[PDB]
Structure 1
């Protein structure tokens, strides 16, 4: 049977469940697909690699020499087989190297979720595989009409918050989907009337979306080192579309990406200017706000279904001596997020 879902929804389902895209992410990470194919990836293997990556960063912080670092770095490559032929693998000594591996493991965890959905469950050739994969997401997905009110506001948010420092590309909104993850509205109930509820961006690689729609935005596992995240292990958002769009990791070889709009209950924000690898918030705080030098103009904030949308053009925030060019918002309880929209974007690279 043929799917009756709208063509943009079918194309969205096709992109997020693409096995060749999952394999392409694993080749980007120099993973040996003979020793670690897509089907042999498992949570316990990724969690054990996160634990070794914590032992690696623990020694870097404790001023250990390259002789001691070598043994811990080699251990990481044992757990996550990389394809280096008969050469020694790149030494994980610097912070930029260890940071990249924590981020690789974050993507691998979501890839394992997506592939587990495709491989678990049933096979029925009489149904359209698009319809079958759609149901695995347990998310109602509707197309938002271009000439509707919510679409005008969303397109204005995209139009106004593209940073001048991210000028290597411009964005075109292809499709706007209104999404409703089953059980999420009920989970959000304790926070639905909290103050400082804002509609914020969350960008991610396309290969992470089957996991985000099936399980919602999650916090990194306990094995993951708290130092591998600027503000510790939470759920990150931005008010500048391009800061979030950069996390799609699109390129001229793959210029289409996906970005989320989520209602986030920020409440009492813990304001910070530099990295703070916290395990828990201070008492009475509900989120972290990383203070950027630039913020969408606060006077241009508008309300969409009771939620504040900071869609104003970027202006100076008045914040001096901060590590951040733009704001970032972090929550440490998954129940503080209610996903609202999912956009498909075309990145027009100007380089």
Structure 2
């Protein structure tokens, strides 16, 4: 794709380009880590030829990942052959792999590993959908969030990654899961951790990179990788388009390929949805309120044929996520976790996750005081017969045996006596009350949650535009 030049080479950012030849783009990033000996270092290499004058150069820059480091610019006055030689020689020295056949890369212990990078207007639409698309399709905000994913929360310091790089990361998490499952904290565990930290760049400052020892860190790493994938899909979706759009967002909307229609505030549907939002605000999430500003009808192509209409127990359940990634869902729908992803990160397995209490799912929006706009999606989910779970058991999926979804039994939850109906789907109104489920052996889940596995059992139905209103801070 679009090949960017490292901006840090100020002497060449505007007069020079990264070299390419078909497949082979002479740009590469290497990472190494060995917690046994506490190495965690990167090495970027880029061949740049000037645009204006015929002159090639090799740029190298190295240091601890996150902390910018020592750089070198070697000019050649157009000696492309020597420069390419130097490039390949250094690549081999640092990797033990030849550069030209980069396709068949094999990392070796005690050497750097490679990684893979991404380097007449009649705007006819309802004004409300226009505001929605402009909100979610704001490329500036996506860039700013990506920059925050490097300098605010150091999860991806050096840059972005590819889908396949994420898949290799998942492979390493699988190896970590296998290792940890046997509770052995010796040498193999340290090497597996080395492989993880090699594939996904982290910045530990100086404190020896710690061993991944419990399930919580596994799941956190998994969520980090998921956020990486989300950013990747969001930037893939926001690709701009030409051909007389007179409002490029209309093509972006086609890319959503999902009808989203404005609803009137006085319609039964709007009022009932507001009732459901308000009645189900958990009392233990009282640091903020939420107001329903607007509500949009959802019609996603292909989902109708897939819905398990035959299955009973159909209810409308929440799903929250940050303002930016929603563009992906509306174009592709919700997906089960990556198969290559370790099962043991999900205390009750993979699949699609929903709540019936607005604030619990709403916590996954990460709205802010400065940025007070968030979205909650409502979907009709045919749960069918639920399997009842008292205590965490990541293996819930084997226990289904004919059931179609899992229920995690929370202390606080609405009782079916208050349930209402919307278009023949069950709407589980609150308030939450005690459910008389308790555990005389272990802990008790704070709140119920429902998980489905077949993607065909979800049908998105309305998208909620929500003002999160925070309060006094001191």
TM-score by length of 2: 0.68
Q: Structure 1 residues 128, 307: CA separation in 2 closer, same or farther (over 3 Å shift)?
A: same
- The Cα offsets for residues 74-117 of structure 1, whole Å up to 9 and x where unpaired, read as 32232222356777556533433222110112222222222122
Moved more, 6-15 or 132-141: 6-15
Tell me which of 189, 203, 210 is aligned to 2:320.
Answer: 203
Is 1:225–2:225 an aligned residue pair? no
Match of 1:16 among 116, 122, 136: 136
State how far apart, in whole Å, the 2-side matches of 1:332 and 1:242 are: 23
Structure 1 distance, partners of 2:400, 2:257, is 35
* Secondary structure of 1:262's aligned partner: strand
| Conserved? CA contact 1:177–1:341, under 8 Å | yes
3-state SS in 2 of match to 1:64: coil
How far is the alpha carbon of 1:54 from its aligned partner?
Answer: 2.1
Which residue of the partner structure matches residue 259 of structure 1? 376
Report how many aligned residue pairs link the two structures.
344
Q: SS at 1:277's partner residue? A: coil
Tell me how large the CA RMSD over aligned residues is.
2.2
Partner of 2:295: 176
* Residues 217-273 of structure 1, C-alpha deviations (whole Å, 9 max, x = no match): 110111111111121111000010000000112232433211110000011111112
Q: Distance in 2 between matches of 1:257 and 1:244?
A: 12
Q: Which has the larger radius of gyration?
A: 2
Moved more, 78-87 or 160-169: 78-87
Name the residue aligned to 1:31: 155
What is the Cα deviation at residue 149 of structure 1?
Answer: 0.4
Deviation at 1:52, TM superposition (A): 1.1
Q: Structure 2: how far apart are the matches of 1:157 and 1:253? A: 26
1:165 counterpart SS class: coil
Cα 1:272–1:25 shift into 2, 3 Å: farther
Give the one of 429, 438, 442 matched to 1:311: 429
SS in 2 for 1:206: coil
Shift in Å, 1:294: 1.1
State the distance in 2 between where 1:194 and 1:32 align: 43
Q: For residue 145 of structure 1, what is the aligned residue in structure 2?
A: 264
- Structure 2 residue corresponding to 1:96, chosen from 202, 210, 216: 216
Q: Does 1:270 align with 2:394?
A: no
Q: What is the match of residue 155 of structure 1?
A: 274
User: Which ranges in structure 1 are unaligned for 5 or more consecutive residues?
Assistant: none
Conserved? CA contact 1:198–1:307, under 8 Å = yes
Query: Which residues of 2 match residues 6-85 of structure 1 at below 5 A?
Result: 6-19=126-139, 20-21=141-142, 22-24=145-147, 26-27=149-150, 28-33=152-157, 35-37=158-160, 41-65=161-185, 68-82=188-202
